[PDB]
Amino acid sequence: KTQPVAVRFALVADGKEVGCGAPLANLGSGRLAGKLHEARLYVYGFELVDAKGKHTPIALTQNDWQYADVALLDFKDARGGNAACTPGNPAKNTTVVGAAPQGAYVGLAFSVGAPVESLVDGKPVFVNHSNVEAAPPPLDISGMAWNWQAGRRFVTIEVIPPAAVIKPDGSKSRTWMVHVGSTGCKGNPATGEIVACAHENRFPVVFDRFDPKTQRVELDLTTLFESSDISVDKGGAVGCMSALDDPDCPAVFRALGLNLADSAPGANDAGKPSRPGVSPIFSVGAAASKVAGGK
Amino acid sequence: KTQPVAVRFALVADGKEVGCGAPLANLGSGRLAGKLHEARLYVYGFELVDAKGKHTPIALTQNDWQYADVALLDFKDARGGNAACTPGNPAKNTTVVGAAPQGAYVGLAFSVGAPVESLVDGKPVFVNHSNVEAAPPPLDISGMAWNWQAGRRFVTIEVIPPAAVIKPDGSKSRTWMVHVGSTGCKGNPATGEIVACAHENRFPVVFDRFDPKTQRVELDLTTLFESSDISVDKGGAVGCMSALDDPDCPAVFRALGLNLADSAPGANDAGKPSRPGVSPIFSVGAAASKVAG
Ligand SMILES: [Ca+2]
Ligand SMILES: [Ca+2]
Ligand SMILES: [Cu+2]
Ligand SMILES: [Cu+2]
């Protein structure tokens, strides 16, 4: 009936595979040498696409890193050292694993973020706005929780530039932070009431041609920070934390493929993809072949 | 010729074994439910003590967590979740492993912190004031470095109160931090100069009776934060980062068993142990237990 699926993800920067303690070269518009502090994101709704364009959902293996249809990617090593990834000291979780019905597939689709709810045994459960203290793994990572109302910062990428970050008032900060999460969220679920968010800030990613056995999904840090001066914060939270009045988020949300505010007056598309299925930071890359070799 | 040696460490709070994502109950002088953000420390100079009182050094296995005679303990889980430690998701590194000459031993002695130098193949290398960008593991962890001149913050324990920490001017930090390292350090080794520190802030820990196969060393977070209102900061860095004029550091250094400043004018003991060999936050407990000693 089923066949195992394994979708590998990779973090890249300046055209090389980074992650763990690897250095980050030529980051931002200033082309600075930065250190990776954190690179975590939730992904969900994984589907394989066949030649006739139909979408077959991947049943995710239920473990500590995957719950219902939601998986948590983390590109840092557990030690927190200054060495690049190795089998002994690897990135914490870079592969989504599961099963799909047997058959031939050609493409891949998935979504970036934490969905509002998901299904377990045909029954729904709150995901994005759940309690980080009560939610099962991997939704119990408070380092990725804002609060229930705001939901999770379901994309947390944090880099450390060589000369820190200068804020408008002049005070210096250590880390340039990219926190992607829902905004305009009204109603507090901690009070037991309903919550709805004006800007969801989730987006799908579609690859018409993707072979999991010889390819991987590459998250490009260079694209992410391309038009951002990571030695400077121009307003709001240091870096970008999804706020519409934050001057630094427009460049980031463009690199994400999301409309920060409305693209046009009355477009009503704030917090939605500007080209669904396409996100400039996500691309297909060659990967070590899982086709078992002889000899 | 030699025998394996494994010294188990455990983090406890409110008389319960904690670590990983176990909650910290009744923490601080306000006795709040806190969460562990980070619990790491360097330890060195491990020795076994026999009944006659002789000291036998333990040769540390060289790996990603132990270099020369220094080991790094890390009580957090790799995931960073809100679950207690389990065999499938355990704390990162809580056992000091090595070998010692075969013999009958009763006690244990070691020291907390990162030493200035240690011998590797009979030759000395700089440890505490090494370059975190260049040193070998486990000295390559920026999360425990200040700079070379200041050395490592060789004790890093960070707790999160239920609401944000409020600084004296009303602004808010998320974590209440304990960063123990040497202070009063002059000279910059980044530029080839000799460094000297007025306050070393390392201390020995001596247990007269410690059986490594049935017992463990317990670091008590309850004692560490007992006289610390972790919901506020009274000045300086948020929490205690060993500054002599930080109003929050006196209570912390008492719990550690260290003199922050001189005990009395002329005493010349600042940065030295208040009672060499005993630290209020360190005790012996049963090795396979859910409860503190
Ligand atoms: Ca900003
Ligand atoms: Ca303070
Ligand atoms: Cu944020
Ligand atoms: Cu500090």
Automatic annotation (TrEMBL), chain A:
Annotated GO MF terms: metal ion binding
UniProt: Cu(2+) binding residues: H179, M241
Annotated disulfide bonds: C20-C85, C185-C197, C240-C249
Pfam families: MbnP
Domain Copper-binding protein MbnP-like: 2-241
Source taxon at top rank: Bacteria
Entry binding sites for Ca(2+): D233, G235, A237, G239, D246, D248
The keyword Nucleus is annotated on this UniProt entry: no
Protein name as annotated: Metallo-mystery pair system four-Cys motif protein
Native source species: Methylosinus trichosporium (strain ATCC 35070 / NCIMB 11131 / UNIQEM 75 / OB3b)
Organismal lineage: Bacteria, Pseudomonadati, Pseudomonadota, Alphaproteobacteria, Hyphomicrobiales
